[PDB]
Amino acid sequence: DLDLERSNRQVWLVRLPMFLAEKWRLGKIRINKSKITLLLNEPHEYDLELTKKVVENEYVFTEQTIPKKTAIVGTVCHECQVMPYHKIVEQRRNIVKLNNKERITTLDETVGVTMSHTGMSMRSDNSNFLKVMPKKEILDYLFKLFDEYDYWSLKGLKERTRQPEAHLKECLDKVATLVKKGPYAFKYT
Amino acid sequence: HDSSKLLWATEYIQKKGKPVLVNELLDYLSMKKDDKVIELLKKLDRIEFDPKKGTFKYLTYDVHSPSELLKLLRSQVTFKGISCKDLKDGWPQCDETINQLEEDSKILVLRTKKDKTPRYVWYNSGGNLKCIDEEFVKMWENVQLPQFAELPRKLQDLGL
């Protein structure tokens, strides 16, 4: 249900410097009739150039196959760009060219301690990581499991009855037939 | 369940190994006094039930004589074949009769003399031929046949 609200709204696009833009992440624009500036709050004033006068085929929309809620804002009216105590800003721009990284630290110890911690040091573990019957009663219980379901694997029966497995195998080789193939493979019925 | 009483009754009458009275069978099983077990026993053809008094017969195979063995062999030509279990359960110690049934009267394959010998039940004519000396067999395997059409030419030169 996309609906255009107005589009009649006129918006101006601005390419700001990084410190003031990240600061915006209020002032008063002074329109001087073909030169306009900006008086921020205490602080600098900024001349904004008429970057592109005619700016058609450019608009602004917002969002509230998968259709989503779409709303139209307004047309772009003028392409602009903010231009800039400037010595402090120039010094900050010279100052940003001083980024460095930390160098490799040299362990200054007596070596024998670190070399002792290298190979065998008689110290293991210290950290958890990648450490990971009567036949008649058994027959009656097997017939109860058959009452629950006729088809069961022998291993599953060994995991349900919980007892010595030899006696259970002997109890399965008397009253139940072992199917080896088909969908009920390796199962007594 | 009553089915465990049915299979337990059949395994018990197989432990007996001889026909007994139905009432005596119900008395030997103590608490198994159900008639549905008797009816399911009448429906079972594995243990034949004779309506005269109490008689329970056991089939795999009624073969217990060498003649019946020969007939059961003749009923397997151009088909398949059974195993050892049915014969050794129908008649105790069949391997003795196999050793007594000389020259293709009862064949088998001796595999291992420690695992009851997995047997075999087929028939032919002679099959013995152990009079052939081992030296003649060794001289028979050392002959390398000339492959392709060299053999018919080598036999036409000798006159055969």
Nearest chain A residue to B7, by CA: A175
Q: Does A174 touch chain B (CB under 8 A)?
A: yes
Other CB atoms within 10 A of residue B121 CB: 21
B1 touches chain A (CB under 8 A): yes
E strand or H helix that includes residue B57 = strand B55-58
Closest CA to A170 of A122, A136, A145: A136
For the record, the structure tokens of A138 come out as 């058994």
CA B10 to chain centre: 22
Query: Is the Cβ pair B4, A139 closer than 8 Å?
Result: yes
The kind and range of the H/E element at B58 are strand B55-58
B7 to A144: CB separation less than 8 angstroms, yes or no: no
Instruction: List the Cα angle A110/A115/A116 in 5-degree steps.
Output: 100
Tell me the two tokens of residue A136.
């008649």
B131: DSSP letter: T
Q: Obtained via which technique?
A: cryo-EM
The tokens for A141 are 């219980």
Structure tokens at B62: 């009624």
DSSP letter string over B8-56?
Answer: HHHHHHHHH-S---HHHHHHHTTT---SHHHHHHHH-SSEEEETTTTEE
User: Alpha carbon of B86 to those of A51, B80, B94, B108: distances in Å?
Assistant: 103, 15, 10, 15
| DSSP letter for each residue of B71-119 | HHHHTTTTS----SHHHHHHSS--HHHHHHSTTTTS------TTTT---
Neighbours of A152 (CB within 10 A): 20
* Nearest Cα residue in chain B from A175: B7
Distance CA B60, CA B14 (A): 12
CB B43 within 8 A of CB B30: no
Q: Is the separation of the CB atoms in A50 and A34 below 8 Å?
A: yes
Between positions 79 and 138 of A, the ones with CB within 8 A of B are 136
Q: Do B8 and A144 touch (CB under 8 A)?
A: no
Nearest Cα to B58, choosing from B29, B81, B89? Answer: B89
Length of chain B: 160
Q: Which residue's entry shows tokens 């694997």?
A: A153
Q: Which residues of A touch B7 (CB under 8 A)?
A: 174-175
Q: What are phi and psi of A115, to 5 degrees?
A: -65, -25
Q: List the single best residue of B6, B8, B44 to mutate versus A (max A Cβ within 10 A).
A: B8
E-assigned strand segments in chain A: 3-13, 28-32, 35-39, 47-52, 59-63, 70-83, 152-153, 178-179, 187-188
Contact B63, B101 (CB under 8 A): no
Report the C-alpha gap between A74 and B26 in whole angstroms.
99
* Residue contact A144–B1, C-beta within 8 A: yes
Q: Which residues pair with A37 in a beta bridge?
A: A30
Cα–Cα dist A73/A59, whole Å: 8
Query: What are the backbone dihedrals phi and psi of residue A168, each rounded to the nearest 5 degrees, phi first?
Result: -70, -35
Closest CA to A37 of A4, A72, A82: A82
The answer to whether residue A170 neighbours chain B at the CB level (below 8 Å) is no
Whether A82 and A14 have beta carbons less than 8 Å apart is answered as: yes
